Amino acid sequence: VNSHLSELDEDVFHHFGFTTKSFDFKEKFGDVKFVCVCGSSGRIHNFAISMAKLAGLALPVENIAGSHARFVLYKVDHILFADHGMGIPSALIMLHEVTKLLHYAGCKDVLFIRLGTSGGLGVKPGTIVLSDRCVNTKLEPYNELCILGKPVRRQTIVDLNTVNELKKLSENLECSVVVGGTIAANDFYEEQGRLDGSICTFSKEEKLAFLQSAYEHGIRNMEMEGTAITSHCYLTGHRAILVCVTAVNREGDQITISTDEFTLFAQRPGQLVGEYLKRNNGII
Amino acid sequence: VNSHLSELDEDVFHHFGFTTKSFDFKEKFGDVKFVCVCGSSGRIHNFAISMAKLAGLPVENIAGSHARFVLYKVDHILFADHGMGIPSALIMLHEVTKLLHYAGCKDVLFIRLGTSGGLGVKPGTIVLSDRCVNTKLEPYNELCILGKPVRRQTIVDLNTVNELKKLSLECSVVVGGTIAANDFYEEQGRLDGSICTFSKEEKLAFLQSAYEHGIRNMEMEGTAITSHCYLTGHRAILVCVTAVNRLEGDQITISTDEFTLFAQRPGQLVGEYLKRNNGIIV
Ligand SMILES: O=c1cc[nH]c(=O)[nH]1
Numbered sequence: 001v002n003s004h005l006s007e008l009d010e011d012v013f014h015h016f017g018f019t020t021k022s023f024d025f026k027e028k029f030g031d032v033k034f035v036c037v038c039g040s041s042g043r044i045h046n047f048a049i050s051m052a053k054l055a056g057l058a059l060p061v062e063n064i065a066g067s068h069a070r071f072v073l074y075k076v077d078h079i080l081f082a083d084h085g086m087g088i089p090s091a092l093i094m095l096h097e098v099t100k101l102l103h104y105a106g107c108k109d110v111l112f113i114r115l116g117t118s119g120g121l122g123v124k125p126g127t128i129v130l131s132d133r134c135v136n137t138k139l140e141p142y143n144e145l146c147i148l149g150k151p152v153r154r155q156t157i158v159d160l161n162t163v164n165e166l167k168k169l170s171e172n173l174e175c176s177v178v179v180g181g182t183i184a185a186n187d188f189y190e191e192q193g194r195l196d197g198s199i200c201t202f203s204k205e206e207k208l209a210f211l212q213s214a215y216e217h218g219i220r221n222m223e224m225e226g227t228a229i230t231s232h233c234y235l236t237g238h239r240a241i242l243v244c245v246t247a248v249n250r251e252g253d254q255i256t257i258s259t260d261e262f263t264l265f266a267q268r269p270g271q272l273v274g275e276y277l278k279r280n281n282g283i284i
Numbered sequence: 285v286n287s288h289l290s291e292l293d294e295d296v297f298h299h300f301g302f303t304t305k306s307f308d309f310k311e312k313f314g315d316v317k318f319v320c321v322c323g324s325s326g327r328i329h330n331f332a333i334s335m336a337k338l339a340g341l342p343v344e345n346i347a348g349s350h351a352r353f354v355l356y357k358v359d360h361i362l363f364a365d366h367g368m369g370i371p372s373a374l375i376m377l378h379e380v381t382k383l384l385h386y387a388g389c390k391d392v393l394f395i396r397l398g399t400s401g402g403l404g405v406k407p408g409t410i411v412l413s414d415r416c417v418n419t420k421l422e423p424y425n426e427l428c429i430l431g432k433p434v435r436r437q438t439i440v441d442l443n444t445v446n447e448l449k450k451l452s453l454e455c456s457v458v459v460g461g462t463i464a465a466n467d468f469y470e471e472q473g474r475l476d477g478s479i480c481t482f483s484k485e486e487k488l489a490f491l492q493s494a495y496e497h498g499i500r501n502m503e504m505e506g507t508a509i510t511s512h513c514y515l516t517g518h519r520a521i522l523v524c525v526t527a528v529n530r531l532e533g534d535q536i537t538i539s540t541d542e543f544t545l546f547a548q549r550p551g552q553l554v555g556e557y558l559k560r561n562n563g564i565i566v
């Protein structure tokens with residue numbers, strides 16, 4: 001743990017717009033055992049409302065975050081909900097402030113579940129990929145950080161037990177569900193091998209060779225936060241999984257599916273997860 | 285220009301929620317010469333509102349329904365948000381520069397109106413970036429393209445920076461270097477994250493070393509903006525207010541209202557600049 005936190009009289013959660021004096025953290029958050037997150041405030045809120053319906057809470061699902069917060073925060077029974085924007089650095093802001101919240105509240109062994117969207121590798125659009133490993137662009141199982149100007153690597157650890165549980169649950173439940181490797185990229189375009197960005201320094205042939213070699217090593221999708229979430233949670237004593245839908249066969253680059261078809265796909269991770277939460281005391 | 289764009293019948297701006305078939309891009313965006321951006325949709329919306337009122341002209345979102353980003357236009361100025369962090373900024377950068385190209389816009393100025401941590405300056409200070417560097421203090425944006433390391437020089441429109449300093453309020457305006465970090469906490473040398481593997485002395489050493497090399501503030505996007513724009517034939521500057529003196533602490537202790545006040549200061553300077561240099565029609 002970070003003993004420097006003892007130096008504070010009050011901790012300001014800058015991006016959630018509240019402080020440790022805003023509530024009794026033990027009282028308000030102490031019962032939390034799950035944290036559902038995704039890059040969209042709308043989507044994660046939508047998932048929270050669905051979970052409140054499943055659990056029988058009728059009162060609206062309201063934002064806990066303060067006025068000028070960057071992130072939203074919801075609570076349904078023993079489940080916390082938050083967004084985290086796009087990319088590893090945004091996700092780390094969420095991760096730091098949420099895990100401090102959990103610690104202050106005395107929450108232990110919490111499960112973080114990322115309900116994201118991604119680009120697939122050799123799988124049809126609509127496919128849910130349960131990550132068996134989050135890996136960087138060089139296919140290395142680490143989150144890279146540069147702390148105080150010095151390079152740090154942090155091993156990526158997926159909750160394989162929960163992942164296998166999810167796979168088994170999926171076998172008993174409108175799409176394909178695949179366990180495979182997941183690429184985490186700091187770019188939506190060039191580093192993910194897209195030819196249709198504003199800047200491109202490689203040919204199609206060079207793109208494909210990069211993608212197949214990734215595929216051959218078992219990669220099934222590509223997104224932008226995985227290495228951050230599955231490395232951080234483990235390091236802070238919690239568990240994490242990625243359950244991501246794919247929006248394209250990286251056959252091409254463009255996301256050509258309609259907005260509504262996309263909305264449909266992006267809810268598929270929530271569908272599987274909601275049942276898993278339902279069967280494992282996420283809700284009363 | 286990426287020739288691969290010609291292989292597309294339609295180009296989908298996924299994160300803005302429209303496509304090349306949504307508008308006549310030449311007609312709709314052709315007169316744009318400025319793009320003002322920041323991490324907050326609300327702040328940039330309010331800024332666009334302020335500029336429209338200044339120009340004596342409802343500022344409606346051009347971006348689609350399920351979009352991650354907002355997009356507004358007031359006369360010759362585009363406004364958009366970009367979340368937090370280099371990867372999220374790159375998303376905005378790719379899609380907006382592609383939009384500018386489809387519109388036939390050339391040599392456009394990107395202006396990031398941000399918040400940051402100050403090094404050795406008082407909170408509420410405006411820092412005009414004369415360089416954007418990484419956490420290793422290199423004036424480059426690092427990328428990993430097709431699994432291979434690539435470095436891109438960061439170019440700040442220093443001519444515009446000089447003009448802004450001359451133009452310049454209840455605050456100081458400083459020209460200095462700007463660190464872009466891939467984190468708010470550990471990579472910025474904060475002691476108050478959920479994880480911290482260093483001491484106060486190692487923190488200060490990191491920041492003093494940065495300060496000695498001219499750095500005056502620290503944020504999370506600068507190297508992305510100032511490398512990408514130069515490579516796509518455009519110009520870029522950062523105008524960021526400071527919210528804390530990082531040599532004195534990490535926590536943002538100023539009130540929400542005061543933070544909001546500070547965060548509007550870059551717009552005060554830049555807004556007057558835009559009025560003077562045909563950003564809006566006067
Ligand atoms: O193809 C995709 C879709 C979502 N996010 C990504 O990083 N890539």
Ligand SMILES: O=c1cc[nH]c(=O)[nH]1
Pocket residue numbers: 399400401402468472502503504527528
């Ligand atoms: O210290 C700060 C303040 C705002 N934004 C940052 O990235 N860092």
